[PDB]
């Protein structure tokens, strides 16, 4: 859902629903953490400094900033996908007539030659 | 009538021109900065115009902080006019 | 509706008979005798100036651009005479829903009278001096709006009839002591030729001197009053005219006594010096009805 | 321009907040005018004969545009009554409203000012502001995306990539190429508005970051293709790798972050049974790539721009986020698959 | 306030008699359930109407800002 | 529309000319029960077609008020009426000296009562008439409240996108 | 005699023709005094004591007076007759005929329109307002207040601070 | 709004609100109907249930339904030239 | 004093009108907060009715009586 | 309804005036004033006839901002006459 109906408008993270549990040491977090390290490699390409890998130790600021913002950004990702599924399952339960079930068949299909 | 009152003054004013007309037979761009500041101040005056006619039903404590606020910024605009305006 | 003609014809006579006052009262200031030969005390001269300029005096225009030059005196005389309508007096002719807003509006449109005259001349020589004359009027209209509001915020709405009723025991000169000093100076900016100076040319005299009486009357409403008396219209009519005449003497006082302030230093008296002073008093006049109960 | 320049820049920042947090139709008109009075001084700055022409062209094409918006505001008083920025209600009001928004975002019949205004800025800092100003009227379109007739919104999207895809071909001025890169990307902006409101704002997140990285790479002064040509051999060679990476992402290419908006634009459109329109979007996207392809030949090829004058001293520009944001602009394909939901 | 509403009923009754006199033969206008689709609250109505006949009374009643006696 | 009868309500409406009614504020104190009940009916039910019966009593009580002043102490009432119309719209200014002649004659009767300050909104109900609470204009709630379920989502397995 | 506002609306358009046409900024400037002053009557007739006079104070006695300076500062070229110029007279005659042809259709009540809305007569229904309010009457009778709209006061003050600072920096 | 206001409120935008004085709007009787109908999410998004209440609200501001009605009466009164016509006022 | 006593007599000597622009406008902000008189003016502004007062139905109500003069509600009588 | 029919026609004339140019540049800024003048009449009448009380302040705010564009854009006009001889739409260098 795009427009809020049950969720509170303008939230820092969620706060209305907190129970979901965020991912711990996820493969998704590692890629954002890799980009934080990658940003601390190409910064020495702009301002000409000796060695991209073994240069200035202000790289720790670049890794942490990508992790801290990324953790909050992925927390919203797990939240928004949950709400999207929650409203989907509630739509089937309340209406029932919109959904139809079919199982087990013996229907003929056209066979291809050559 | 307001329409009858206004038109009588103009029609008598036009008649005085014809008397003299028919009867006898035989650069610097520094001025612009003054003109602009007139317009920008008068709009702050336009916002400060309702004060004697507005303050009758509304709460005074909510208005007091907001009424002075426009005049303060009207002085800040004049404070920017002190940091070299020119020879004018 | 006959009263409109009883507020143009005696008013045009008042602008005419000013020529006596403007050089006899000004005369005794300069120890010279004014009008004396023409009439018994020179009373025949004001009407004699009308016969001289209107009928016999011909025209020699610089270019005459179709509609203009023969349109600027209509705007000059028309706006000066329409200012008499919203005036409270003992009783006003067709009283407006809001009084002083009509007064400030027709004075701000009276700037055009000196604007179209600058466009009438084809030469660049005249228009630079013409725009300088606009600057004398346009700048002082900023403060004129501020000092008006401070008097209104003390007591009464925009209606001019309510301004007479609020002055029952004491004048508004005493509570508005620095503001009353401002109206003596700010009014002189509108082509009075006392702090600064720049056929159809004769018609401008009939319009410019008309505004002088207009500012004298308008100061005698905002600051003077003494008594109202609705039952007796006789007592108010005589007492109002004497108060206005005393302010007319002060208008001719500045013209004789004091030299011109320079155009550059006119923008040092105002803007640099007056605008911080007027707004500080405006700040004071916002707090006054809140500090002590004073709402119409 | 001392301390007060930051205050002038702050009023553009605060101006968009008025547009962002709004319920009244006259409040956004105030919000647009907060930008009008605050961009013009930065458009001038040094005062140039080219700057005077650009600022007047920027004013007249945009002030008249916002005046058309105020008509639609007043029709919302004549019809439907209420002063709310929820729905447009009247079809008569929407015709003047969408065209007023097209004067700032749609661009297909209102592009004319862009290549002259963007070129007319004497400074690199003014180039960022025009790519940041486009955020403001997008907030309006996100509020009133229903009721507005789709027949004359999608024409503003289809034609814009056509004129954007041809309008950069005969241009050597570096500011002019980026001016038509706006119109080309604005077609993708005015296409997701009828088909699912989400990812339309993420299109801005990809675009604004990608464009802000571009002009900050041009902090080492360059205004033409030949002036950006002398950069690999005479100037910093490692810097041109990041210019290459950002330009490749500007066009639709999968291993880069710039392909990730182009995913959902077609995906949400195909869900609404439309195939003939997204096909035309993909073919015209090739024309966009060609400008960046020729501009990557200043970074890849030799091109012989050696010159007698050589720089030895180290360059120190402003560079606010010219190190953190290009890393997101080069690679975010694996980083942002589920991030579509996070924005809206 | 009662004097306002007493006049509004009397002005409508004169309008109802004029509608019955004018519409008789060709037009199929019955004038029932009023102009409103809801027909439960009923607004001012005679603010715009106020009887079409006699212009001398209509000009003084509508215009108040003009002249202003 | 269904309009009221041609006979309507109140025979011979209003006493005489204006300002006369504005001169006496004693109309607030004496005869208030018909005025307040009409006021209570009209704000609850906005239609003039329903609460016209209470308005019939208002105009009838209006004649009862003016007749009492015309019978006893008519000389101070006529002199006060000439004072208020000679001036513009002062109402109480420059007429307070002639107001002293008024009320003093009325004080002999039980009719005299001063307003002093303000009404401060008085609440009184006795007649009620059908109570009247819900009428307004609306007929239906329209589709009622929208269906919304709350259970709290657990985790939701697998993302919708191609990359998972 | 019957109409009050409808006559003033014709003069309003009459002054506006010298804007689509190009009669120089001198004669074109004169149009805003004619259309503005008559335009106040359109506002004033339905009410609005304060708002009706604001056009005289700002639009007429402030806006166009500053425009009086700029005509002398830039492009003066000594004022010329707006009849001798080519295409100017053609734009003026076509401008009036778009509105004056509609004036002929006002007779017999109904008039043809490009818009879907019908015009009819509307003489007594032109105002479409009852007495209602008495003491402190009219919606425009208390038009402006600093209360409730506190946010609007701050931004207007902020925008007027920008104008003074910016225009000083350009010159 | 793309970003909503929290805690502090700065609105007074919609029709039928806490007015400056005690004086109410001209269409306030019809204004209340549109607010009470579209307070739920599934009413204006559907735009089928509130069709009757909106048309009565549209009748208040424009007065188009009353204008066409008064047009027919005024034309027929003009049509009765040299014929029987009602006159009392 | 380095700024209190030093930058006072110089301000009175050079540009003397600028003293009044800060003193009068400054005290215009200070006075309406500290002085105990502003609270009285707010009460009379709310007490004076602009429109007619509404009548409520009586069903167990305190400090509410008839239109005649009686001890009910607030009713302002502050200072004569 | 009836009064709105004329001022909407007056709005279209002022709209074309913005879009029309012959030599002079001053007409556009004069038309910007006229456009805001025509919008001022349209806004006032809708609030005055159909009462709002709170919303009657909105055209007063609109009156202030109308002058802001007609001064800050008007200031740019003088800058053209400093670089060039006189203001002309015909006199432009940008391509």
Curated annotation (Swiss-Prot), chain D:
Keywords: Electron transport, Formylation, Membrane, Mitochondrion, Mitochondrion inner membrane, NAD, Respiratory chain, Translocase, Transmembrane, Transmembrane helix, Transport, Ubiquinone
Enzyme class label: translocase
Topology with respect to the bilayer: Multi-pass membrane protein
Subunit structure as annotated in this protein's UniProt entry: Core subunit of respiratory chain NADH dehydrogenase (Complex I) which is composed of 45 different subunits. Interacts with TMEM242.
Catalytic activity entry: a ubiquinone + NADH + 5 H(+)(in) = a ubiquinol + NAD(+) + 4 H(+)(out)
Family matches, as InterPro entries: Complex_I_Subunit_2 (IPR050175), NADH_DH_su2_C (IPR010933), NADH_UbQ_OxRdtase_chain2 (IPR003917), ND/Mrp_TM (IPR001750)
Highest taxon in the source lineage: Eukaryota
SS bond partners: none
Segments passing through the bilayer: 2-22, 24-44, 66-86, 95-115, 121-141, 144-164, 177-197, 199-219, 238-258, 273-293, 324-344
Identification of the protein by name: NADH-ubiquinone oxidoreductase chain 2
UniProt-listed Pfam families: NADH_dehy_S2_C (PF06444), Proton_antipo_M (PF00361)
Similarity remark: Belongs to the complex I subunit 2 family.
One MF term in the entry's GO annotations: NADH dehydrogenase (ubiquinone) activity
GO terms under biological process: mitochondrial electron transport, NADH to ubiquinone; mitochondrial respiratory chain complex I assembly
Cellular component terms per the entry's GO annotation: mitochondrial inner membrane; respiratory chain complex I
Record's function text: Core subunit of the mitochondrial membrane respiratory chain NADH dehydrogenase (Complex I) which catalyzes electron transfer from NADH through the respiratory chain, using ubiquinone as an electron acceptor. Essential for the catalytic activity and assembly of complex I.
Curated annotation (Swiss-Prot), chain E:
Source species, domain of life: Eukaryota
Localization terms from the record: Mitochondrion inner membrane; Nucleus
Family: Belongs to the complex I NDUFA13 subunit family.
Known function: Accessory subunit of the mitochondrial membrane respiratory chain NADH dehydrogenase (Complex I), that is believed not to be involved in catalysis. Complex I functions in the transfer of electrons from NADH to the respiratory chain. The immediate electron acceptor for the enzyme is believed to be ubiquinone. Involved in the interferon/all-trans-retinoic acid (IFN/RA) induced cell death. This apoptotic activity is inhibited by interaction with viral IRF1. Prevents the transactivation of STAT3 target genes.
Record's subunit section: Complex I is composed of 45 different subunits. Interacts with CARD15, but not with CARD4. Interacts with STAT3, but not with STAT1, STAT2 and STAT5A. Interacts with OLFM4.
Name of the protein this chain belongs to: NADH dehydrogenase [ubiquinone] 1 alpha subcomplex subunit 13
Designated gene of the protein: NDUFA13
Shown residues within the full chain: 75 to 100 of 144
Swiss-Prot record, chain H:
Motif (Cx9C motif 1): 27-37
Motif (Cx9C motif 2): 50-60
Positions of disulphide bridges: 27-60, 37-50
One term under GO cellular component: mitochondrial intermembrane space
Annotated ranges, domain CHCH: 24-68
Primary location: mitochondrion
Secretion signal, residue range per the UniProt entry: none
Subcellular location: Mitochondrion inner membrane; Mitochondrion intermembrane space
GO process terms (BP): mitochondrial respiratory chain complex I assembly
Bilayer disposition of the protein: Peripheral membrane protein
Keyword entries, A-Z: Disulfide bond, Electron transport, Membrane, Mitochondrion, Mitochondrion inner membrane, Respiratory chain, Transport
Function of the protein: Accessory subunit of the mitochondrial membrane respiratory chain NADH dehydrogenase (Complex I), that is believed not to be involved in catalysis. Complex I functions in the transfer of electrons from NADH to the respiratory chain. The immediate electron acceptor for the enzyme is believed to be ubiquinone.
Domain notes: Contains two C-X9-C motifs that are predicted to form a helix-coil-helix structure, permitting the formation of intramolecular disulfide bonds.
Subunit and partners: Mammalian complex I is composed of 45 different subunits. This is a component of the iron-sulfur (IP) fragment of the enzyme.
Family statement: Belongs to the complex I NDUFS5 subunit family.
Full protein name: NADH dehydrogenase [ubiquinone] iron-sulfur protein 5
Organism: Bos taurus (Bovine)
From Swiss-Prot, chain J:
Pfam families: Oxidored_q2
SS bonds (residue pairs): none
Keywords from the UniProt entry: Electron transport, Formylation, Membrane, Mitochondrion, Mitochondrion inner membrane, NAD, Respiratory chain, Translocase, Transmembrane, Transmembrane helix, Transport, Ubiquinone
Root EC class: translocase
Cellular localization per UniProt: Mitochondrion inner membrane
Membrane topology value: Multi-pass membrane protein
GO terms for cellular component: mitochondrial inner membrane; respiratory chain complex I
One annotated GO biological process: ATP synthesis coupled electron transport
Organism superkingdom: Eukaryota
Outcome (variant: residue 64 to A): In strain: 66
Protein EC: 7.1.1.2
Transmembrane segments annotated in the record for this chain: 1-20, 28-48, 60-80
Principal place of residence: mitochondrion
MF terms (GO), sorted A to Z: NADH dehydrogenase (ubiquinone) activity
Subunit field text: Core subunit of respiratory chain NADH dehydrogenase (Complex I) which is composed of 45 different subunits.
Function according to Swiss-Prot or TrEMBL: Core subunit of the mitochondrial membrane respiratory chain NADH dehydrogenase (Complex I) which catalyzes electron transfer from NADH through the respiratory chain, using ubiquinone as an electron acceptor. Part of the enzyme membrane arm which is embedded in the lipid bilayer and involved in proton translocation.
Protein name as catalogued: NADH-ubiquinone oxidoreductase chain 4L
Organism: Bos taurus (Bovine)
Gene: MT-ND4L
